[PDB]
Structure formats: structure tokens, C-alpha cells
């Protein structure tokens, strides 16, 4: 008989294989559509999630209730030391899809990126690209020029192989993250020239993104272990007097199909899923060398983005950072993949220019009531430890 009272199904079947993500690093499954009339530019970047904080700003939204009034907004911080471009990959079209025809590497690769090619780097001979390095000396780079010319002649998609400078982060990991970033704009020859000129060179995130831009964040979400249906799918708890467990789904299928169906909520892995969250506004791109990168026009105190006592379980953001409105998937220390938006933005919320007024830097480790150590000293006065 029919279900007595109508109700929508719990959860979405669009994310249905609720399994652990295949790879820790987020995967850019689609790059923004290329336009040859635009100047050559990278379409993505990598960073590391440092934490969240609070900002205050005057809202510029005519017709809104909070128009021209202060609003408090949560933002996320991504520590973004400059990436190093180390390679080029050319892609050709085929009746079976895109395929990489060839890739060209820089003459010298650092140990950070060489660690990515090893499981036991400590006890290895570290011979990762030793024979390949000789191609730049043999015949005056004839093979390198040959591969670059092949990419120019045949390939229609050009990507750079770039890696993070994870040693500039407070992370204990020494193995860098390496990924392909598509070059958009210009001709294929322009793309190849741009990528080759960027070889073993640092690119900073302000050359890729800019303030008030809407971007996407790709990452693997926070992992929970084996989780029951109540939390995994949001089902209703069964009554208190239920025998053999109330944290369940009462009926997991009718009789006639005679199988448990794929659409029925079941206990299993929760979290640690690959997610591409979209439409996140960049509120600020702060520089590492700026001693007041968390200061404001109306807040002139010279302070950096790091909260008092440091980001909890991260450390200090000593490098360039991006400020993103709202939250992004993934825990702290996670490798974030920032991608340019695939959408066209016309709404005033997306097109608004954001002017910060104050950035919270109080302690994340408790009910922090002070923004700076000098403010703490001024408020408390002299202590016993000051002698």
C-alpha cells in the first residue's frame, strides 16, 4: 500500500557512492572554458587550510535590510605560499577523449617535489630525474625543444605541472603536492611559451586570483569513521521502546523486489568525500611580507592574520593568504585546490566589491577578548612575571 504521509527522501543520490575519496589531494575535474582572445593565465592554485575567523564589513546591497549597515561574517583562511612551476603537459583530442601526448620537465627539480615520487625517500638513492636532467645538456636541449615543438604543433590543451612549497608552511609534512593547472587564453604557442618561461619559477596567488572574485574550493571533507544511518543520512530516530536498536531504518525495503535497493539508507563510511564547493567570494589576498596584512583602512593596528596564540592545530600564516567568505570542505592542514569559477556571475551579491572594516585576531583557543598582545598588556597592567 502507498506511503501514508508524503515526505522527501533523506539525502541525495547525486553523491551516492559514499566511499572514501580515491585521493587525498582534490581533483579538478573541469577547468574553465578556454578563450583564445584572453591573455594567457593559470586557472587554478593550491593552498593549505589554516582556519576560520570573523570579519565586519559595511554591506553594499540596495534593497536589502542590512544595506549600508555593519555585518559580521565568518571567513576561511588559506595559507598560500607561492607555487613552483616545474612542467608542461600537452593534451590532444581523440574520439575517446582528451589524452596527454607528452610532458616536458624543468632541468632541476627540488627535493620537495621529488619526495612526491617516492614512498621511502629517506632510504632511497634519490635518482628521480637524474637521467632526464641530462637532456638539457645533450645536443643543446634538442629533445626538450622537440617535445615543446610537438606540443605546439599537435596539442590543443596546455597545462603546467606545479607543486607547493610546503616547507614554508608550519606543516610537519615535507612531501610537496603536485598538480596540473590549465593555461587559458592565447594560442597554443602562447601557452607553451608562458609555461616554459615559468619553469622552476614561483607564481604567487595574487597573479592567479584577485579580490572580490568568485572561486571554487576542491578538497576532501572531514572524515568520520563507520557511521550509522541516523547521522549518515539524517533519518528519524525510532521510538525509545524499540527493541534491538532505535538508531536504524525500520523498513529497508518491500517484499516483491526481493532485494535491498541502492536507494535505502545504510550504515557505512561518512565524510572524507571529494567535494567541489562553488561560489566563494575572495575577501582579501594578504601578503606574507606585509606586517599589517590583517589591518584595515578603519582599523590601523599593525597586526597579521594569525590569531593570538596561533591558529589552533595549524600554527602561523607567514605567507600569502586568501580570505574566503563562509566555509570550505576539509579540515585544517588540508591541501585546498582553488579553481576559477565555471559560471557567469551577474547577481549583485556576486558582483559586489567588498571593503573590510575589521578582522578578528583574538585567540581561537578560548574566549579570546583581546586582539593583540599589546592590547592585553595595556588592559591587564603589570603582572608578577614582569618583575
Amino acid at each position: 500500500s502507498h506511503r501514508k504521509y508524503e515526505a522527501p527522501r533523506h539525502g541525495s543520490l547525486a553523491f551516492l557512492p559514499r566511499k572514501r575519496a580515491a585521493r587525498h589531494r582534490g581533483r579538478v575535474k573541469s577547468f574553465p572554458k578556454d578563450d583564445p582572445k584572453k591573455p594567457v593565465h593559470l586557472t587554478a592554485a593550491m593552498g593549505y587550510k589554516a582556519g576560520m575567523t570573523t570579519i565586519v564589513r559595511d554591506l553594499d546591497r540596495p534593497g536589502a535590510k542590512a544595506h549600508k549597515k555593519e555585518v559580521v561574517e565568518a571567513v576561511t583562511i588559506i595559507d598560500c605560499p607561492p607555487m613552483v612551476v616545474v612542467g608542461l603537459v600537452g593534451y590532444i583530442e581523440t574520439p575517446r577523449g582528451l589524452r596527454s601526448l607528452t610532458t616536458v620537465w624543468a632541468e632541476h627539480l627540488s627535493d620537495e617535489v621529488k619526495r612526491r615520487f617516492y614512498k621511502n625517500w629517506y632510504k632511497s638513492k634519490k635518482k628521480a630525474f637524474t637521467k632526464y636532467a641530462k637532456k638539457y645538456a645533450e645536443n643543446n636541449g634538442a629533445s626538450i625543444t622537440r617535445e615543446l615543438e610537438r606540443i605546439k604543433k599537435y596539442c590543443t590543451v596546455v597545462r603546467v605541472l606545479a607543486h607547493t612549497q610546503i616547507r614554508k608552511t608550519p606543516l610537519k609534512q615535507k612531501k610537496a603536492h603536485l598538480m596540473e593547472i590549465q593555461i587559458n587564453g592565447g594560442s597554443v604557442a602562447d601557452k607553451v611559451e608562458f609555461g616554459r618561461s615559468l619553469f622552476e619559477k614561483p607564481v604567487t596567488i595574487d597573479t592567479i586570483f584577485e579580490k572580490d572574485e568568485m572561486i571554487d574550493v576542491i578538497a576532501v571533507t572531514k572524515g568520520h569513521g563507520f557511521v550509522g544511518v541516523t547521522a549518515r543520512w539524517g533519518t528519524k530516530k525510532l521510538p525509545r521502546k524499540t527493541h534491538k536498536g532505535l538508531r536504524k531504518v525500520a523498513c529497508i525495503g518491500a517484499w516483491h523486489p526481493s532485494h535491498v535497493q541502492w536507494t535505502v539508507a545504510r550504515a557505512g563510511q561518512m565524510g572524507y568525500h571529494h567535494r567541489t564547493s562553488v561560489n566563494h567570494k575572495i575577501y582579501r589576498i594578504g601578503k606574507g611580507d606585509d606586517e599589517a596584512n590583517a589591518s584595515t583602512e578603519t582599523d590601523l593596528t599593525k597586526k597579521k592574520i594569525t590569531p593570538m596564540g596561533g591558529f589552533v592545530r595549524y600554527g602561523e600564516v607567514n605567507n600569502d593568504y586568501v580570505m574566503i567568505k563562509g566555509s570550505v570542505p576539509g579540515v585544517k592542514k588540508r591541501i585546498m585546490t582553488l579553481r576559477k569559477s565555471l559560471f557567469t556571475h551577474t547577481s549583485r551579491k556576486a558582483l559586489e566589491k567588498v571593503e573590510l572594516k575589521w578582522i578578528d585576531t583574538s585567540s581561537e583557543f578560548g574566549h579570546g577578548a583581546f586582539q593583540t598582545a599589546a592590547e592585553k598588556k595595556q588592559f591587564m597592567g603589570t603582572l608578577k612575571k614582569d618583575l
Partner: protein
């Protein structure tokens, strides 16, 4: 139902008894429904400061008892925040009896009134004292 109201924490579900902040003669208001409530299985309709509800008078004058009245919640004890980021709450839950058009049955309001009710209902704003 009020228009333009921003999302806020709803503190009073159906079945809640709140104080009567006006001088209509009712002592309390027993919420039986909320105007903007949608449809969802098992979910009790709930209202916050500044939205219209349907209520009955459990304690008060006999010619106000035993009937259904429109009412507006003027303050609630459940903490909530506005776009300014400040979480605030009142000492008690209280509302006032109004017409379906939003005109108060009483002529005075006792105690403070949340800003949402004053902004959304001009009669309550005119009859109110301290706002937020």
C-alpha cells in the same frame, strides 16, 4: 505574514504558552499555529520574534477566552542573532493580540519589544516603549 523578515532562531513551537505584553485583558497566549509555516512530516510549526501566530487565551478575561486570535511575538527567551552578529535574548516569551491586518487589540505594551516586531508591525512600533 510579515514580508522581508530575515531568518532567525525560532524559539516558540506550537503548544508554547507565552505572556501577554499588552493590556487587552489576556494574561497569556497559547500558540496553536504559525502563519508562515510550511509542510514537513512531524515538524512542529515554530515562530520567532516578530511573526504572526494563531493563539488562544488560557488565562484572562472570559470574553477573550475560548477563541482563536491572531498574535505577534514581541520577545522570546531563546537566544538569536541578527546580521550584526550579536546573540541576544529576553527574559520571557511575550506577544500581543492583533487583527489579521496587524492592528493591536490593546493600546499599551508592557516591557521591552524586540526590534523585528517593531520593524515589521507599525502599530506595535507605535505602541512600544523600549525597542531591543
Amino acid at each position: 505574514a510579515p514580508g522581508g523578515k530575515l531568518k532567525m532562531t525560532l524559539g516558540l513551537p506550537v503548544g508554547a504558552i507565552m505572556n501577554c505584553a499588552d493590556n487587552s485583558g489576556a494574561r497569556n497566549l497559547y500558540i496553536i499555529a504559525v502563519k508562515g509555516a510550511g509542510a514537513r512530516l512531524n515538524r512542529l510549526p515554530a515562530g520567532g520574534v516578530g511573526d504572526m501566530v494563531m493563539a488562544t487565551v488560557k488565562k484572562g478575561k472570559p470574553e477573550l477566552r475560548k477563541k482563536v486570535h491572531p498574535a505577534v511575538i514581541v520577545r522570546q527567551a531563546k537566544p538569536w542573532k541578527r546580521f550584526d552578529g550579536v546573540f541576544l535574548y529576553f527574559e520571557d516569551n511575550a506577544g500581543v493580540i492583533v487583527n489579521p491586518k496587524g492592528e493591536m487589540k490593546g493600546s499599551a505594551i508592557t516591557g521591552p519589544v524586540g526590534k523585528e516586531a517593531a520593524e515589521l508591525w507599525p502599530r506595535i512600533a507605535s505602541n512600544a516603549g523600549v525597542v531591543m
